[PDB]
Design a binder for this molecule. Sequence first.
Ligand SMILES: Nc1ncnc2c1ncn2[C@@H]1O[C@H](COP(=O)(O)OP(=O)(O)OP(=O)(O)O)[C@@H](O)[C@H]1O
Ligand SMILES: Nc1ncnc2c1ncn2[C@@H]1O[C@H](COP(=O)(O)OP(=O)(O)O)[C@@H](O)[C@H]1O
Ligand code: ICS
Ligand code: CLF
Ligand code: SF4
Ligand SMILES: [Fe+3]
Ligand SMILES: [Mg+2]
Ligand SMILES: [Mg+2]
Lengths: 477, 271, 271, 522
Amino acid sequence: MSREEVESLIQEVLEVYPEKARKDRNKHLAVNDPAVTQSKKCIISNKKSQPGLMTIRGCAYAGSKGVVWGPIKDMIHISHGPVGCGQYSRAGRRNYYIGTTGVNAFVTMNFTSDFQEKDIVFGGDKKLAKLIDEVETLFPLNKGISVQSECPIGLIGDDIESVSKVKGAELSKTIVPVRCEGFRGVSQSLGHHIANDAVRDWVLGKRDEDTTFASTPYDVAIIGDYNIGGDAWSSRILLEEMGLRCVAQWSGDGSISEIELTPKVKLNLVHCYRSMNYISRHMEEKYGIPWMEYNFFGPTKTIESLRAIAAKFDESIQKKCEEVIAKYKPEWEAVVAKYRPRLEGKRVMLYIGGLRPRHVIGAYEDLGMEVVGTGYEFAHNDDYDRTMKEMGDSTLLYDDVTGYEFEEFVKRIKPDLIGSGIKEKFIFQKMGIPFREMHSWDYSGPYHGFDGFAIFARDMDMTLNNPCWKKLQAPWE
Amino acid sequence: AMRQCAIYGKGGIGKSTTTQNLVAALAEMGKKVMIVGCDPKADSTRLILHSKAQNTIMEMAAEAGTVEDLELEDVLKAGYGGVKCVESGGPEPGVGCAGRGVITAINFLEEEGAYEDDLDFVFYDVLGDVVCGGFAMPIRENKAQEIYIVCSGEMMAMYAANNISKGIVKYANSGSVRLGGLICNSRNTDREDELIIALANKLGTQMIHFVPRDNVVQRAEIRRMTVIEYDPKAKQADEYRALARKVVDNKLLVIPNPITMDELEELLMEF
Amino acid sequence: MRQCAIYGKGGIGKSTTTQNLVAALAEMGKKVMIVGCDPKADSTRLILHSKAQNTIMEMAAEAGTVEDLELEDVLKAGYGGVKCVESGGPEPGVGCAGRGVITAINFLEEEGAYEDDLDFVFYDVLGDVVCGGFAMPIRENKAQEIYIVCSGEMMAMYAANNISKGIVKYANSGSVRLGGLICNSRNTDREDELIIALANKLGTQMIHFVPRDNVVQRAEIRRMTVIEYDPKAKQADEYRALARKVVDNKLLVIPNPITMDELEELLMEFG
Amino acid sequence: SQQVDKIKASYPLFLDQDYKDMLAKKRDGFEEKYPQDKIDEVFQWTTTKEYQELNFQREALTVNPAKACQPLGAVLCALGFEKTMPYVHGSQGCVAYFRSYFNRHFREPVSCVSDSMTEDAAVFGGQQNMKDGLQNCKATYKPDMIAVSTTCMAEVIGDDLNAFINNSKKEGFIPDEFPVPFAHTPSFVGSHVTGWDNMFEGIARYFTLKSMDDKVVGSNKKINIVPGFETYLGNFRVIKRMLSEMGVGYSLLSDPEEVLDTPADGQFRMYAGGTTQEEMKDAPNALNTVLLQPWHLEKTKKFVEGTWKHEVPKLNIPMGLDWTDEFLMKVSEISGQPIPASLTKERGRLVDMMTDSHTWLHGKRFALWGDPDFVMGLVKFLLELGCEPVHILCHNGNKRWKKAVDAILAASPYGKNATVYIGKDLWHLRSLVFTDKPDFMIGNSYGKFIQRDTLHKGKEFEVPLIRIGFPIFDRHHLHRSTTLGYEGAMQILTTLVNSILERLDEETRGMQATDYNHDLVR
Ligand SMILES: Nc1ncnc2c1ncn2[C@@H]1O[C@H](COP(=O)(O)OP(=O)(O)OP(=O)(O)O)[C@@H](O)[C@H]1O
Ligand SMILES: Nc1ncnc2c1ncn2[C@@H]1O[C@H](COP(=O)(O)OP(=O)(O)O)[C@@H](O)[C@H]1O
Ligand code: ICS
Ligand code: CLF
Ligand code: SF4
Ligand SMILES: [Fe+3]
Ligand SMILES: [Mg+2]
Ligand SMILES: [Mg+2]
């Protein structure tokens, strides 16, 4: 569509809101212009959601527990508060790991205090101490405990800092108290920030004086990759095939030892800027470790990222990077030859959280498809700044989009594919538009790396060209 | 006639004591009055039951485990003149959430059934620092419809009364709860009576009774026996009977409207 | 930097006395900060010339979120260069003032209001203290010295010992200590001996005996503190002596809570 | 490496040699993992009985619970009414979690909204959030009614839902005649079934407490059915079909099957079917009200008896032979309509399927968990099949329900080795199935981890999971099955017998070792 038509569609969609809601939502919809380098002049981000408009955003408890701390496998994470949250967030995110669940790994488990009315009225400090004692009694092989605070804990002023400090000192254990109450902030981003602050204060500086770890000039840490079906492993195999040594993974398949060993690395490879930029900046300022953004979504982005990473080291690393690129070229070339004809010219609309709306555009372009509209759940203005460059002319940008807005935007655009979460999958499937879950990879994956590119292409081809989408109209209607 | 009332004001003016002697005076000539203690300090029923503490709702809820399996008679007891007594209770200071305790205790009383007998009065006692809806539950719907503010002649009492009148605007514009009157507990202040009637007409209301700063109350509190229990022939006994009469025959109740600050500034100049 | 917390009941004179104390302390050349944990916003009404100020939470709401609020918008100078802030909160009967004070204190800690260039920090808290939000000022990395303001009334003793029992848990867990008892005279019979006995049982030191008068009220009507309303009156000299002695105070002892039978005995030996 | 003609997903791609070598290198170099022998020792200890005593001595830690919070049930109850928008007063993360949960269980769109209450709303209150949210929801999604629930954050601070909604109506944010029922759903009390009960009671109060002056019992010659928290559309369908076959006028309140089974024909329907407002306004005129799941409909029962003056029958859930016949007989007595020949033929066919499968169903030891009414109905049905329950678990049960289940067990000789647990979680159940091993487990998708643990101990200690309950995430379209009535009994019996036969076939597939019992006919 033309630029004058996207604005008309935006106005027609906004016409249904009341005055306050319309005025607020007019600031969150924009027509892309890659020339503009400041996203503040076109879109407004990181504000509170309008009440009663069916937002897709989550809470700070999600952004901390289910995002940052949860993937850590050797730790035990306590959902301090009522049951719901832990139950709703149990095993819903596919942060893959290797370990014996119930013995030394606890990712898919749900530990909760299960607050009652008497806990609200009288407190939860004694109950928390008893819970820590029972956790240590029944799960002796855990390497740490984290306390994720749910809303009531923040409201009633339960002092989990002192309980954590006392129990950790007396039991010689690392107990990290996290104030990730849902009502804090507007979305999962503040949960990311709180979890990063907890990591900085209670975990990161534990080995500040230990010098037993021998460091090589090829030490790297993957920052912000959470192994959604093995993406972290796929990236790690490429990084290790380059001659680089990965010491830490944050936090998919990550261990507390990797977090402790991170300050000894020579370079931080940040995948998700939105979630771990604060900890990357803290490490850069305190230990002098530089950090850089890398993207392993599609062959072009992967090759560019490998070359940029190899540019940070000596000639042997560059030679190994060239060897890896040459080795992996025929496979992704064959994948393109197989799947691009079936996917050429197709239009894609995306609505994901903080990073993936701009990171996956490269793969779609590698497969011959174009992105006609992308959007962020909770991303800040810097993410949109990076997003304007990657998106073409006259493409719609939306922040904190509502179900109504997304429904009519899709109705007016008629995209060939929609990539969003589980809360819009069936809405758009019943509309006759192929849908792909861009958070869990539709229980497939991994999609990062050369190995993940083939799975990505196969999944897009099977979802887009399925015979079921041509059968939604009865022959007699 | 199922008259649900509540006492408001800031702490130290004497809301509790005032309602204890008020119910004691009421109980003389045949009232089935029940009092509810919404104070976590557990003193709103002290003199009537003649026992410092009893089985409060939250204590028994913690002992049993849940409110559903908690009996009504285990927490509700009768004392002088058949004054059925009950107290919400709560946590020790500095921990927990007392407003939630008040909420669950009031729900307990409402849903087991306590507003079933004659219940001439369902007097509620609240704390001065109403900082949440938990302590505003007594003035919710199907609850107290007549609020009395205990105040004296002094800047802090006027500030408390103004803030409380502001707080009884949100719950009154969407309900039937009104303001009955203002009760006076003297601080031994100069030409106070005229100042207090000036405040009463400033809010378009009337002052029910003026209670002097008598030293009998502090003597009755240490022996934890109300003035009616103390002796049926005292000066305060007759005064509290007058309070009882003017609180049972009350007919004036209007929606409070907040007033401006200039009067608070220049009240002392007028008086 | 010395961080102090003032506890007690409402209406005893917690705020009043604290404000004149810090005004006199600033007159001696001390950089002091008042953090008002009172949702009524009445803890800085005599140092700040602003009538109602621009509270932390009200501007947090006007700015959308607390993270969008800067320290300069809520931290304003008063008499003698006294830095002060107000936690703010809701109108009575709605919301949660404990979360308000918690958010205000976390905001102050986040942007470093304790710049290590000050001398004393005084927290003015709620009298009721019925939740952990108002017990936040007495946690770790917070106020270490607690001065309980008490009055001649026996419920002042009851609230003082209940507050001390509440303090006990934080004193055991952390390092907060009871400093002493500022006893505000209510013109009662030989109250000073009873307060001395209560301090001796608690093991603390009674601070001073600032009496009941009228020049404090006439200074309030002027809307400033006592000391700089008329630097001459005896009460100003007593407040300056209070500032000096809290400057040189060094006795910090954990409170020992007493039962109501014990308190009845203290009432017994001085009726 | 990937071959384009045969692409591998994570499994079995990460079973390749290069990925295995990199995993081992990472582990040994940086994971600082405990030695494998210590891990095996700890696992074996966790499978023992001393660990079971330690696990059952728990007092403050809950591991893998089997329950959710009240607003989930409140939303599920609100979804059953015509053009009704479930509104949750509180935080948006709760609504997101509810929608994800129901999307995963039902594979259907689930409409729910929130006022997105923040820290300032937690401190000053949620009056403005309520006003703006009601106005925006009505303007945007245009529902005929908004049902308000609560999150724990609002309940702790004591939000006055009645006053908030009344002020919203008074200031013009919503029309004064627009129906906005509300219910208090504290998440620290009860569970999701309690939330369903609270929401239904609130809606019933809203449409019927102020208009009882012109109501007479039996005026409309209908029977009200309250289904409770139900996640099987087949139950609603079978109840309606049975009552239509008996020729009995019925008003099923809170019927959500239409909105949870919308067709895919090119358009998105936010609302479909549901109980109408006229049906609930005319509810007191029915002859009687019947509760399908009475053990979590206590407040509803109290309100119905106190206000509608309906003598609610003391009926169990229509699960199994005896209870389905009791339900049908009570309905026939209330309405006067005799039980027709079709239901008799269905009962006879079900008894003939029981007779056919009794030789394989007898003596089987079962561990089960779920909702109180569902668990007790399953236990009863297992008792009529000759099976032996051993571990009965209900995280949201109380002492009275436990006493009822104990009486049911004592009424039968197959309940001799059966113990009932209330307040326990699935870690306790794992300890139980490791110490006292049953043949099979009946529960939701959370028991697959218990099956994994039992398999890790050994093939002879494996306890297979039979998926009957809520929520089921690892299987597709199981929410379309039936649990209540004769049809549900046939479905459950077929599932159980086929699970037993599948396990037997798996155990006897070894050639020249165990294939002597790989019989063609079973
Ligand atoms: N008429 C009176 N004259 C003198 N003293 C009185 C009189 N009435 C009550 N008192 C005394 O004044 C004090 C009142 O304190 P009380 O605890 O009753 O106040 P309150 O408003 O209930 O406080 P809070 O809300 O903090 O619990 C008590 O010592 C009481 O005995
Ligand atoms: N020493 C004193 N003599 C007489 N009145 C006093 C004295 N100190 C304080 N007051 C008065 O007591 C009242 C309550 O004091 P304030 O500090 O405002 O209450 P709170 O204890 O609730 O903070 C005020 O009107 C104040 O002027
Ligand atoms: S952490 Fe974030 S919503 Fe960066 S909360 Fe969310 S596993 Fe999304 S766009 Mo689900 S900021 Fe990760 C994300 Fe991106 S859970 Fe995953 S897919 S790259
Ligand atoms: S915004 Fe987030 S998910 Fe919501 S409560 Fe708060 S931390 Fe948790 Fe929890 S038990 Fe259920 S789901 Fe809530 S109502 Fe409470
Ligand atoms: S202010 Fe009220 S609601 Fe908030 S924590 Fe304190 S008692 Fe609870
Ligand atoms: Fe579907
Ligand atoms: Mg009182
Ligand atoms: Mg004060």
